[PDB]
Amino acid sequence: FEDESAPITAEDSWAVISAFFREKGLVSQQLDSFNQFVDYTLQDIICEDSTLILEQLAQHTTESDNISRKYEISFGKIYVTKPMVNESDGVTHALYPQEARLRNLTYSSGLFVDVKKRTYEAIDVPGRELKYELIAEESEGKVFIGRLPIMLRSKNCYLSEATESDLYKLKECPFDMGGYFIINGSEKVLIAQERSAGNIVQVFKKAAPSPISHVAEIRSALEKGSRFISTLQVKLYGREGSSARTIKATLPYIKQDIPIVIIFRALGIIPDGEILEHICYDVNDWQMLEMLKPCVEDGFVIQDRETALDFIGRRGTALGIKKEKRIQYAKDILQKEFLPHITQLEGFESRKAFFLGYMINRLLLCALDRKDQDDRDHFGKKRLDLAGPLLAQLFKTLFKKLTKDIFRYMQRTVEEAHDFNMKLAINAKTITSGLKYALATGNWGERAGVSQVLNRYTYSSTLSHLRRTNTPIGKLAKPRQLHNTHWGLVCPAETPEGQACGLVKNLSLMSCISVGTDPMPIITFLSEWGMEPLEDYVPHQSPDATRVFVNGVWHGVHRNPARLMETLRTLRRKGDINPEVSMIRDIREKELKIFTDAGRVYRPLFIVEDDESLGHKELKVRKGHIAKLMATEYQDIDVEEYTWSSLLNEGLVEYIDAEEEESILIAMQPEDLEPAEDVDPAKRIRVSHHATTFTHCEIHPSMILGVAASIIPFPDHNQSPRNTYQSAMGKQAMGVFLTNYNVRMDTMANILYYPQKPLGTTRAMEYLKFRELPAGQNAIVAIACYSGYNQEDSMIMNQSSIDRGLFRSLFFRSYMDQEKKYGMSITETFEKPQRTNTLRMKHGTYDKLDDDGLIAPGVRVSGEDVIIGKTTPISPDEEELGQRTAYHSKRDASTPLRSTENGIVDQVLVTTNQDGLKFVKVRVRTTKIPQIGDKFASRHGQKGTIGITYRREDMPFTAEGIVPDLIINPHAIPSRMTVAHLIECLLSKVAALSGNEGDASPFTDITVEGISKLLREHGYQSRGFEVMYNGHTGKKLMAQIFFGPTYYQRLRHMVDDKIHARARGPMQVLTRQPVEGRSRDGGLRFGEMERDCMIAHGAASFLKERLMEASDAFRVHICGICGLMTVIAKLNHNQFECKGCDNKIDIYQIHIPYAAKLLFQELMAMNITPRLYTDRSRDF
Amino acid sequence: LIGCRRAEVARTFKEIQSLIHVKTKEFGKTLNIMKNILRGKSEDGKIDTDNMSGAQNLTYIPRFCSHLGLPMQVTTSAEYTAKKCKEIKEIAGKSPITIAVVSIYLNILLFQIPITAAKVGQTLQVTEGTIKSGYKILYEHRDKLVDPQLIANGVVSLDNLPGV
Amino acid sequence: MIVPVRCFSCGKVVGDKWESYLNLLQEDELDEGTALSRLGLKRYCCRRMILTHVDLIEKFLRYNPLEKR
Amino acid sequence: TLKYICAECSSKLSLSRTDAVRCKDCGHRILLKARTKRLVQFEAR
Amino acid sequence: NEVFSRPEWMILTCLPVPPPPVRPSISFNESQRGEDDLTFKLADILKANISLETLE
Amino acid sequence: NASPFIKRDRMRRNFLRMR
Ligand SMILES: [Zn+2]
Ligand SMILES: [Zn+2]
Ligand SMILES: [Zn+2]
């Protein structure tokens, strides 16, 4: 601006937000995780079990056969191709997403690995170790190992290098964001899975009815090398009213809880004083030592390393160890399976002992009421698994299976004397199917709901679905609640209203998920700067040292934590340590935790430093920076590039996660909180908090909301539940989900005729493209009690406005059909069947089909019309209802249009599937015009259906002649307290009168009084009231009507897709009761609650008729001797018989529901005899 | 082999032999027996069409061209050349694989793609000498082995084909 | 997708003013409020018709035609 | 025979029940059935 | 009960086979045939029964 | 007491002009 060092304002923060979204986008987490997995994780997985060795020993049978062979298969580098598809005839070509969607193909690339096949041989002289030598056979080629589905708009996809024009050529929408997969032609989004972080000690309290009072648990996890989890639990047995409370730890593969002292001695610390020194780090904390004395007393009889190890070993579940391999067995368990996340190599007992003491110390601190039990809902202890890690574990499992198959083939080839064919040893189908099956379904194996069909109802729906997270609900916590740690990380308003309330979360706009990096460089850096190793740490000679943790591993201690943290922070800010790395300094606890693992959710914040030039703390970002941010923003529409990364590398913004958020002070705004320190009565009361130690500042408070809540105008003037309702409902509004809807064949699609952009908009909406792809219209809304047809959440719509096109939409439905081949003999074809050669032809009309069995686009269709004609051949010697003559050789397998739907055929495409069979897609157009059953909503939870429609001359009018497009009841306002609805109408009224876009972002300086002054400047009543006239008589209404524009949305629920009645119709095969489903002419359920109500009414005969004549009614014949339905009745011959009873004259007929007959027969199958009798044997 | 042929995506004997280790003699005798069995149960208990015939060379060309990475235009020209190649008695008796490979090679040099016969025969596992030997026979009838439209437009001229 | 022919509320013809509206915005450097009044749109029902319209047909025209003559 | 249109090169083809579903010009495997040439009536409401 | 329930009858020696109405055979395309889960288990009982008969 | 309008159409022109 003027000075490149002047402080910025709250308006300049939106330039920073704009830069953030220019660099990242809205689906950054999906693309970033996949790119990391494909780039780095795939190579790592194959470099874990790359070597497979098959040793053929001497097999001493004769001295002419004394050589021992060793065959080795090793995997080298892995290569990935571009997406491709192989046809039935064996031709492979590049596949683009548009063709994959239309042809039901999977968008995937191929994986290749370099394989080295070595063979050594050695002379097996008896009773000697061998010297294997390479026998001059080292073959070294690329081997196909399967196909990897490719996420769209990723590094390996064809659309990452495409410009806007290129996307248009490829029939792709520029507004499309990617982040999903195409499996069998279906768009699938991977929902992030929420889990609890590993390698963190957590201390919990147990209820009264349990011998254990406290338990410190750590789910040890190693991110690289084996992926298996082993849990260690340290339990404090006994209650507070006991005379002896000891501590016992659970080790893997030991079957029993060992006293902690025994474990310490097994690690090499025999002196009791040293053990206590490892647990308690203060020599005068006698209260903690007093609680430790019982432990050292329990394990007194063991006083050396070997006896302790044998004590551990005999508890182990191996029973192959005899008595002498049993000490080593315990030693190996303590080395490779005890606390694996520190290390698994020989010679690190000191680290294990110190960490075990650390866990015990935390357990005792909580047991002594010095610490509170760890909060399970703390969002900083949670991890979100994205597509990257999810595909990583799936691939790890599948590659293990592939390698196992490879060796089994090697062994089988060596024994059964066959030739080795590398084409059969490696089955590429293993990788291809496992990834396809897991992505087609949600079943992550060989967890559910991990993959869902991406919503494409509207643009906002797609964006929200691509940023959802899930939490699988025995647990002791309240995970459904909105925790404090959720601030600025997940939207506080967007959650389902059903059983998923609080379990399905949505990321905030500026939220991000880390991909994780290598912790080794940081550990090496710490070692060079004075992080004294943990092998020489004497707690009693340094009772001020800070413990240094890296990914939950206690690596050492530091004498000057302050300088180390300063050096670490400066390195991260200038760009030597990855910004995703989280650094926390718990000054009181004397701990320094560094986190580098993947799955931590973080968000950016401004950095606040002293800058003594002004004498008070201020943001590092100045107006000079903001000037160049916007200069680069507008030069695109050439100064040096200056992006979000430049802010990050210059130390002006900082990524912060929930755990690091515990040690910082944040200012809501730089306007008032940063400056050292009449008022407008209309402005809200803002609390200063008068703190002079701020370390960071919010970019803007509005970014705490998600995609769905960022469309709400003035969400801070609404009751919170209304914001939640709108977040859910905004995903059901018709709009323009994509600009290429005329080249896509979706199952269903709704397109608004004339989408408008809201008069009252939000600044966050600038990045959601709601102005380019809006979902709704600006209707002139009056809040009045006009005719009583808007009572109880209904509305009156203007028929004249409907006639002109208000809220009118297109509806598209696609029908799919294939030419199946039932083996080698029976095959189908698309045909126009004739009534003389085809059986079971539908009662509809085939007049619109062509010779290929398809209706040409542009033809109008209606109910029962056949749009895809198909026939299949039949087997002879099967006659149904007569009507089956030698002329008939085909049967109808046609596809009719939906019974209730009609329209015009819009598009017909014919192509071939992966297997080369012909299949077609037919799309039908129809226009939906608002009627008296359609649902409409505003952006404030106010939804309703049209009660009635009126023409313009019947509606209430103003002196200017303006009539409402929509009338809602005043009674909808008070109880719901949706004040934002009324503020939006006032703002939109001013916006239309002045020709501007109203600013409705939540936390701003805009007040109702300011809008009122603007409205009065335009010659209108300041509060939005107008004098209206009755349309029937023309007289003034005694009251004045709140009247102005409001953004309404047409929802997905239309009555014409719900109305359905049934007199009689098809029945189910099993129970012979009305079928389920409106689409199948089904009936309605007269359930148990309805039965109870009719019992309360005393309508016995009506209850019987509903259950008998309106549903299954069946007549059976029962025997008078045995009450079984075993009577063979020849009703034509008037003969009855119950063989077994040898009677023909004691038969009765009863009327029971067919389900009752089914029930009794099922009981008969279970050897139960329900005998129905027509007379009583006992008195009441 | 029968299953592939019934599906109109027939393969060759060598291609199937790449996976299932069976030498030619047993393969042929078994195939003849099974075809008789299927025919026997087709009459007493359809089975075959124009596809069942062994040669059916036109089906091999699209995959063979794909292995070489040629554009679709060359593949269509190769199909036309192979289709018309059966009118010459000096080549008609050759194996369908060679008939398809030589036709593909003729078009490879017609459009001037830089792929030598040393790799065409190495990719399709066909002796290079056989490829060049057959190419000589498919040089005295070039006017009948090139699509009239392609030469008419100007995409390909017959002087780009070397003559011995 | 394309400009509505009539105002929804009162039915005044507004589909013959889109190009005039755009030309006023571009070449005359007028604010949208002044342009709306210069076009004769006085009632705010008509102003929001032209002020909130999104021209999607321009996006649809970027795709090559399905069937060329 | 009936007339179809390629989905990428917009070439008008004529296929029979025996012909393979593919563009003879560019080789695409998706074809669009041509619009019917009989007039269709629409109400202007 | 002497007449309706004896402890000897809690052991199954002869199995009643429910009629098809209890275990109907559906069709998805009517060129494919499916059987009820009860039919699958009843077939298992028969195969296990005949296996035991032949063995002993 | 504030400007309740998102001014985008010509504020880009103002900044582009200022430079
Ligand atoms: Zn009886
Ligand atoms: Zn109007
Ligand atoms: Zn084409």
mmCIF file of N, CA, C and O in Angstrom, chain A residues 14 509 703 707 710-713 757-758 760-772 939 1047, chain F residues 6 8:
data_model
loop_
_atom_site.group_PDB
_atom_site.id
_atom_site.type_symbol
_atom_site.label_atom_id
_atom_site.label_comp_id
_atom_site.label_asym_id
_atom_site.label_seq_id
_atom_site.Cartn_x
_atom_site.Cartn_y
_atom_site.Cartn_z
ATOM 1 N N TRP A 14 -8.244 -12.067 3.750
ATOM 2 C CA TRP A 14 -8.875 -12.798 2.660
ATOM 3 C C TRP A 14 -7.950 -12.949 1.461
ATOM 4 O O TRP A 14 -8.125 -13.886 0.677
ATOM 5 N N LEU A 509 -12.585 -25.480 6.269
ATOM 6 C CA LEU A 509 -12.112 -25.029 4.964
ATOM 7 C C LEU A 509 -10.591 -25.002 4.894
ATOM 8 O O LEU A 509 -10.006 -25.409 3.884
ATOM 9 N N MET A 703 -13.306 -19.519 8.940
ATOM 10 C CA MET A 703 -12.783 -20.765 8.395
ATOM 11 C C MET A 703 -12.979 -21.954 9.324
ATOM 12 O O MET A 703 -12.581 -23.064 8.959
ATOM 13 N N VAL A 707 -17.661 -26.942 4.269
ATOM 14 C CA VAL A 707 -18.166 -26.594 2.945
ATOM 15 C C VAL A 707 -19.652 -26.265 3.008
ATOM 16 O O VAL A 707 -20.108 -25.280 2.417
ATOM 17 N N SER A 710 -20.513 -22.974 5.044
ATOM 18 C CA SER A 710 -19.989 -21.740 4.475
ATOM 19 C C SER A 710 -20.942 -21.103 3.473
ATOM 20 O O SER A 710 -20.668 -19.994 3.004
ATOM 21 N N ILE A 711 -22.040 -21.776 3.131
ATOM 22 C CA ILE A 711 -23.060 -21.182 2.276
ATOM 23 C C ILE A 711 -24.142 -20.472 3.084
ATOM 24 O O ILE A 711 -24.885 -19.655 2.524
ATOM 25 N N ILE A 712 -24.245 -20.751 4.377
ATOM 26 C CA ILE A 712 -25.272 -20.122 5.214
ATOM 27 C C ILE A 712 -24.948 -18.640 5.380
ATOM 28 O O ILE A 712 -23.813 -18.299 5.756
ATOM 29 N N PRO A 713 -25.887 -17.727 5.121
ATOM 30 C CA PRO A 713 -25.635 -16.309 5.413
ATOM 31 C C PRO A 713 -25.930 -15.992 6.874
ATOM 32 O O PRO A 713 -26.972 -16.377 7.407
ATOM 33 N N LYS A 757 -27.428 -16.709 -8.588
ATOM 34 C CA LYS A 757 -26.516 -16.601 -7.463
ATOM 35 C C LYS A 757 -27.149 -15.767 -6.356
ATOM 36 O O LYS A 757 -27.874 -14.809 -6.633
ATOM 37 N N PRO A 758 -26.911 -16.100 -5.087
ATOM 38 C CA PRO A 758 -27.608 -15.391 -4.008
ATOM 39 C C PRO A 758 -27.288 -13.904 -4.008
ATOM 40 O O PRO A 758 -26.166 -13.485 -4.294
ATOM 41 N N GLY A 760 -27.504 -12.290 -1.156
ATOM 42 C CA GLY A 760 -26.667 -12.315 0.024
ATOM 43 C C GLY A 760 -25.722 -13.495 -0.016
ATOM 44 O O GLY A 760 -26.141 -14.643 0.162
ATOM 45 N N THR A 761 -24.447 -13.226 -0.257
ATOM 46 C CA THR A 761 -23.429 -14.250 -0.430
ATOM 47 C C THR A 761 -22.416 -14.180 0.709
ATOM 48 O O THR A 761 -22.492 -13.329 1.597
ATOM 49 N N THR A 762 -21.453 -15.097 0.669
ATOM 50 C CA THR A 762 -20.419 -15.210 1.686
ATOM 51 C C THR A 762 -19.057 -15.194 1.008
ATOM 52 O O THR A 762 -18.912 -15.632 -0.135
ATOM 53 N N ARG A 763 -18.057 -14.664 1.713
ATOM 54 C CA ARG A 763 -16.721 -14.596 1.132
ATOM 55 C C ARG A 763 -16.106 -15.980 0.981
ATOM 56 O O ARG A 763 -15.350 -16.220 0.034
ATOM 57 N N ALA A 764 -16.413 -16.900 1.898
ATOM 58 C CA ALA A 764 -15.968 -18.279 1.733
ATOM 59 C C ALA A 764 -16.559 -18.909 0.480
ATOM 60 O O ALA A 764 -15.934 -19.786 -0.127
ATOM 61 N N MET A 765 -17.755 -18.478 0.073
ATOM 62 C CA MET A 765 -18.379 -19.024 -1.125
ATOM 63 C C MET A 765 -17.589 -18.712 -2.387
ATOM 64 O O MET A 765 -17.802 -19.373 -3.408
ATOM 65 N N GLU A 766 -16.689 -17.728 -2.343
ATOM 66 C CA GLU A 766 -15.890 -17.402 -3.519
ATOM 67 C C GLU A 766 -14.999 -18.565 -3.933
ATOM 68 O O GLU A 766 -14.623 -18.668 -5.106
ATOM 69 N N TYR A 767 -14.654 -19.443 -2.997
ATOM 70 C CA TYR A 767 -13.772 -20.569 -3.264
ATOM 71 C C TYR A 767 -14.523 -21.883 -3.424
ATOM 72 O O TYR A 767 -13.911 -22.888 -3.795
ATOM 73 N N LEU A 768 -15.825 -21.901 -3.154
ATOM 74 C CA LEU A 768 -16.659 -23.067 -3.401
ATOM 75 C C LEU A 768 -17.328 -23.026 -4.767
ATOM 76 O O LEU A 768 -18.050 -23.964 -5.118
ATOM 77 N N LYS A 769 -17.104 -21.965 -5.544
ATOM 78 C CA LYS A 769 -17.670 -21.838 -6.884
ATOM 79 C C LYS A 769 -19.196 -21.884 -6.849
ATOM 80 O O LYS A 769 -19.841 -22.374 -7.777
ATOM 81 N N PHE A 770 -19.783 -21.366 -5.769
ATOM 82 C CA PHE A 770 -21.236 -21.304 -5.686
ATOM 83 C C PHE A 770 -21.824 -20.237 -6.597
ATOM 84 O O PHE A 770 -23.013 -20.314 -6.923
ATOM 85 N N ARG A 771 -21.030 -19.249 -7.008
ATOM 86 C CA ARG A 771 -21.474 -18.267 -7.985
ATOM 87 C C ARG A 771 -21.402 -18.788 -9.412
ATOM 88 O O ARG A 771 -22.108 -18.268 -10.283
ATOM 89 N N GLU A 772 -20.567 -19.792 -9.670
ATOM 90 C CA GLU A 772 -20.467 -20.394 -10.993
ATOM 91 C C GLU A 772 -21.433 -21.557 -11.164
ATOM 92 O O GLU A 772 -21.955 -21.770 -12.262
ATOM 93 N N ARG A 939 -31.744 -21.157 3.326
ATOM 94 C CA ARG A 939 -30.454 -21.534 3.887
ATOM 95 C C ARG A 939 -30.429 -21.445 5.406
ATOM 96 O O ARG A 939 -29.370 -21.181 5.990
ATOM 97 N N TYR A 1047 -33.029 -16.311 -0.877
ATOM 98 C CA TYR A 1047 -32.517 -17.403 -1.698
ATOM 99 C C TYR A 1047 -33.149 -18.709 -1.236
ATOM 100 O O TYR A 1047 -32.884 -19.177 -0.124
ATOM 101 N N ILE F 6 -20.178 -7.203 -0.937
ATOM 102 C CA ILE F 6 -18.948 -7.827 -1.418
ATOM 103 C C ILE F 6 -18.594 -7.139 -2.733
ATOM 104 O O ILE F 6 -19.215 -7.392 -3.767
ATOM 105 N N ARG F 8 -16.323 -6.868 -5.631
ATOM 106 C CA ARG F 8 -15.321 -7.632 -6.366
ATOM 107 C C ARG F 8 -15.151 -7.173 -7.804
ATOM 108 O O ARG F 8 -14.050 -7.273 -8.351
#
